[PDB]
Structure 1
Amino acid sequence: EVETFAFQAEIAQLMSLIINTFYSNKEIFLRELISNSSDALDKIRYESLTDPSKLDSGKELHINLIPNKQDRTLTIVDTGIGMTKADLINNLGTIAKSGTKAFMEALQAGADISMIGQFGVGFYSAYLVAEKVTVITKHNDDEQYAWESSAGGSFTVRTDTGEPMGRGTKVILHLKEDQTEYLEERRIKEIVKKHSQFIGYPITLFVEK
């Protein structure tokens, strides 16, 4: 049972702007997704400060980067607070309508695409490198759900019958054919060191056979 939703008009515009604008500094997508994961981990940590049982679904607070050349995917896993179904539908927990409005007003005022994270819609920079994005997520108060979109104005939401996560969010980027450099270890390492050197959680870059 798959439900299909239309993006709000402003978010569909933001996505086609990211997909069609010529912009060479595509590596900022990883900084934005790691920063989103750090925010989600800060949230479950703060909640656990007054209620330790919120960590019953997993005490470790971390971020994993998993490249897979066979599937042409780069996956960013965090054990943060996760997202409910309502959150997923509501633009993955962001204020994406007013965020897009401020971002686009800033673009015409001298900003560039790399500043997207300052307007709360950094997740969508995933479409700088990915043709399709799958988000698997588990919040303590809800079941495990899968969100998916290849842009084009719509996304789907379904109950995820896959591997149980415990708690957190998994962003799977199905990379464009000419963006496979972001599957190479030394390239990911260079980008993490350049843009995410001070993240307060351990970032583990997995290797392949």
Structure 2
Amino acid sequence: ASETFEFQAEITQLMSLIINTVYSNKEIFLRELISNASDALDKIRYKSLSDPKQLETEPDLFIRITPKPEQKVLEIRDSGIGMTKAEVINNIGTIAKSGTKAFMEALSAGADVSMIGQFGVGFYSLFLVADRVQMISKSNDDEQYIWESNAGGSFTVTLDEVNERIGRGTILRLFLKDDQLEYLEEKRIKEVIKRHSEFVAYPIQLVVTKEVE
């Protein structure tokens, strides 16, 4: 059974602002997600300094990108610390965010959407290219949960009984808009990573499907 939660008022405003933007440099969504993944990996690594056993649910530290062309989906996975149900509910929607309103005001004044991460709300950049998102996350401290939003005023959180098991970490599953299908292509993905993510401490893996002939 799913639980439904309302987004804090300014977050809803932010999403609507981002979803309805003709902005021309949307590719920065990937830098933001890779940067979040790297933060989550830094955190499990730092945490394991004083408790090495935390790594054992997923001993490999990586970032993995998987296009699913036939579903028009792009997944970005990490084996970082992941988030508990309570963390997902608290930190991804229901509580007011330090920087939401200030980022919107900066946008109004001519700021580049690229700046969104400097305001601590870069997660929401995913709506530049996706009209719907599932975030699937497994923390060592909780079960696997699915957070979902179509940028309306509410999101859902559901115990996960339908997706592959994550040993530990997070999968961002982006349902791409029809005009943003370029991010399913191996070539384009590599371009964006090389442009915006030159310096990442963790391996970035790209999953590519090809017909044998």
Q: TM-score, normalised by structure 1?
A: 0.96
Q: More deviation in 18-27 or 86-95?
A: 86-95
* Partner residue in 2 for 1:8: 8
Distance change (3 Å), C-alpha of 1:93 and 1:58: farther
Given that 1:68 and 1:74 are in contact with CA atoms closer than 8 Å, whether structure 2 keeps it comes out as yes
Residues 94 and 120 of structure 1 are in contact (CA less than 8 Å); yes or no, is this contact kept in structure 2? no
CA offset at residue 111 of structure 1?
Answer: 1.9
Contact 1:94 1:121 (C-alpha < 8 Å) held by counterparts: no
Partner SS state of residue 177, structure 1: coil
Per the alignment, residue 207 of structure 2 pairs with: 206
Counterparts of 2:150 and 2:111 in 1: how far apart (Å)? 26
Partner Cα distance (2:181, 2:42) in 1: 31
Q: Distance in 2 between matches of 1:38 and 1:65?
A: 13
2-side partners of 1:103 and 1:186: how far apart? 31
**Which residue is equivalent to 2:22?**
22
Mapping for residues 46-195 of structure 1, pairs under 5 Å: 46-92=46-92, 97-161=97-161, 162-195=163-196
Contact kept in structure 1, 2:18 and 2:125, CA below 8 Å: yes
Uncovered stretches (5+) of structure 2, i.e. residues with no partner:
none
Q: Deviations over 1:81-126 (max 9, x none)?
A: 0001011111339975222022123224442211000111101000
> Corresponding residue for 2:39?
39
Give the letter for the 1:124 counterpart.
Y
> 1:71/1:185 Cα in 2 relative to 1: closer, same or farther (>3 Å)?
same
CA contact (8 A) 1:145 1:158 kept: yes
TM-score by length of 2: 0.94
After superposition, the CA RMSD in angstroms is 1.5
Query: Per-residue deviation at 1:127?
Result: 0.3
Change (3 A) 1:68 1:96: farther
SS at match of 1:75: strand
1:61 is aligned with what amino acid?
Answer: L
